[model samples]
Target: MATADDFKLIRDIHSTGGRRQVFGSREQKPFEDLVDLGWLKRSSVDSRATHYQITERGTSAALRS
Candidate 1:
């Protein structure tokens, strides 16, 4: 189960234009934790910087009231 921290991380990424820096950062752990829990997907774009996209499962989970 995702904690409130996980949800905040996911929402931050989502609101941040779908991508954010992964290195030299403080929010890295929660970001990666969300990925580990299958709430987000991390990938490398053509620019070689990492990007994050909320998965379909994540979308459904996040939309709950």
Candidate 2:
């Protein structure tokens, strides 16, 4: 059940470039399901925000989605 928000976040992350593409803040609101799918990994939990990075296969799977 991939939603627009899911694609939205992944699409943003895909354009980030670099190996360690990290994204966070409000954009992470829709990450719960994606995380469960193993398409994304949470690195650190900040005070008011959380950091996340996409895995290698995640980039692959996300595109196929």
Candidate 3:
């Protein structure tokens, strides 16, 4: 199970006004891994800034945690 800090990261991405760029940062991989694990989905595609939203699975996980 993910921690509150993990949920905070998920929330930050969704609340980031559609997109956020985390290139060249340590956060990039874990964020992408969350998507791969079906905890999140891209709301839109962007060449510069990638946007993501918590999936239903993610919401349920959050609530349960």
Among all candidates shown, the one with the greatest lDDT? 1
List model 1 lDDT by residue over 3-51, tens digit each. 7766666767657876655752554666666778877777753344456
* Most accurate candidate by TM-score: 1
TM-score of 2: 0.61
Q: Where does candidate 2 stray beyond 4 Å?
A: 18-27
How does each model score on lDDT? 0.66, 0.61, 0.64
- What is the TM-score of each predicted model, taking all chains together? 0.66, 0.61, 0.58
Evaluation by TM-score, superior candidate among 2 and 3 = 2
Judged by lDDT relative to the true structure, which candidate is superior, 1 or 3? 1
CA lDDT for candidate 3: 0.64
Candidate 3: minimum summed lDDT over ten consecutive residues — where? 17-26
On the 0 to 100 scale, the lDDT of residue 32 in model 1 is: 61
Better lDDT candidate (2, 3)? 3
State the TM-score for model 1: 0.66
